[PDB]
Amino acid sequence: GHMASMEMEKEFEQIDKSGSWAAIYQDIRHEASDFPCRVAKLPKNKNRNRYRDVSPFDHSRIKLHQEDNDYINASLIKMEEAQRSYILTQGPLPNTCGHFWEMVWEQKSRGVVMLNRVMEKGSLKCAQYWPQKEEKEMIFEDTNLKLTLISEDIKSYYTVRQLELENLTTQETREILHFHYTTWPDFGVPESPASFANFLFKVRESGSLSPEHGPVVVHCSAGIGRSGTFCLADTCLLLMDKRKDPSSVDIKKVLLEMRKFRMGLIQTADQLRFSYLAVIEGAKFIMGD
Ligand SMILES: [Cl-]
Ligand SMILES: [Cl-]
Ligand SMILES: [Cl-]
Ligand SMILES: [Cl-]
Ligand SMILES: [Cl-]
Ligand SMILES: [Cl-]
Ligand SMILES: [Cl-]
């Protein structure tokens, strides 16, 4: 509400004017939790990790319902006070797309949030894990899942797709919404915080963040930088509406809470700054400003 917005904008101005983003961001890095990632580092899981230096903590990792190997590079971020949960995961690999959709099915997720393009900077950031044409569905034979593109709505800053995910073992089918933010720049942060806040509102409006469903699945390439920005802004905005007096929300403390559940969330000072901007813009929109 009004008081939380005022204090947020105030704290932003003070950091910005004093050139403090890099120092604040270094502090967060220094203070952040360290927990073991023993399962991620097992030799049999080397081909399930996109990056050697980005791993889920054992305590918060998502387990596939698999006797063979339950490992996927994905973490449950559980925000107690805000009453929101998110699964943050790396962009699927060629050999982990079946695992990805198994996780979506097992966790009962309604939405998938993608914040990168399959190719960026001339390199593959993520496998093509969803079908691009209605008439060419995908079958994941290892996990017995079928995935059909039903429709897509292409907007200037993002695309929304309706997907149909079918468990071939049981023939149950589910509608999954794919919220694809397609315009994050190859370097730096988006020029429009408002486009990103608007994107977050479209995800919220679909019910994908709601407790009736399993946690939304959020990914970029490593699942920590852009993905961290998305969930940090969402949680901060919720808290700004939930809290009484003082109504103020401390973004650094919220980010440190989130980093208890996955390492490295928010990978640059510029992403920290962008996070504040998206929250500020989002709150103005909510208040009808
Ligand atoms: Cl092993
Ligand atoms: Cl919280
Ligand atoms: Cl893409
Ligand atoms: Cl950046
Ligand atoms: Cl990325
Ligand atoms: Cl706080
Ligand atoms: Cl870091």
Name all domains of the chain by residue range, CATH numbers in brackets: 1-289 (3.90.190.10)
Technique behind the model: X-ray
Of the residues 97, 126, 220, 236, which is catalytic?
220
Question: How far apart are alpha carbons 11 and 242 in whole angstroms?
Answer: 19
What does the radius of gyration of the chain's CA atoms come to, in whole angstroms?
19
Ligand number nearest to the C-alpha of 223? 5
CA of 250 from ligand 6 middle (Å) equals 4
Which stretch of DSSP H or E encloses residue 114?
A: strand 111-114
Instruction: Respond yes or no: is residue 220 known to be catalytic.
Output: yes
Q: How many CB atoms lie within 10 A of CB 95?
A: 11
What's the rounded Cα separation, in Å, for the pair 146 and 40? 27
Q: Which CA distances in Å does 168 have to 134, 171, 193, 266, 288?
A: 18, 5, 41, 37, 46
Query: Rounded distance, CA 216 to CA 110, Å?
Result: 7
- Is 224 annotated to bind a ligand? Reply is yes
CA of 173 to the centre of ligand 3 (A): 25
| Residues that place a CB less than 5 A from ion ligand 7 | 29, 264
| Edge-to-edge strand ranges of the sheet holding 84-89 | 61-63, 71-79, 84-89, 216-219, 111-114, 172-181, 158-167, 145-154, 138-140
Which two structure tokens, joined as six digits, stand for 11? 């704290």
Contact 105, 174 (CB under 8 A): yes
- Taking the C-alpha atoms of residue 197 and residue 278, their distance in angstroms, rounded to an integer, is 5
- Report whether 267 belongs to an annotated binding site: yes
Task: Tell whether 226 is in a known binding site.
Answer: yes
Cα(142) to centroid(ligand 6), Å: 43
Determine phi and psi for 249, rounding to 5 degrees: -115, 130
Among the bound ligands, name the one nearest to the CA of residue 272. 4
3-state secondary structure of 119: strand
User: What would the two tokens of residue 60 be?
Assistant: 């918060």
φ, ψ of residue 123 to 5 degrees: the values are -135, 150
Q: How far apart are CA 71 and CA 69, in angstroms?
A: 6
Specify the amino acid at residue 83: Q
DSSP secondary structure, 174-231, as one string: EEEEEEEE----SSS--S-HHHHHHHHHHHHHTTTTSTTSBPEEEESSSSSSHHHHHH
Give the whole-angstrom CA distance, residue 37 versus residue 54: 10
First and final CA of the chain: distance in angstroms? Answer: 11
Residues whose CB is less than 8 angstroms from the CB of residue 158 and which lie 6 or more positions away in sequence, other chains included: 179, 180, 181, 182, 183, 195, 199, 202
Max Cα–Cα distance, the chain, nearest Å? 59
Q: Which residues pair with 186 in a beta bridge?
A: none
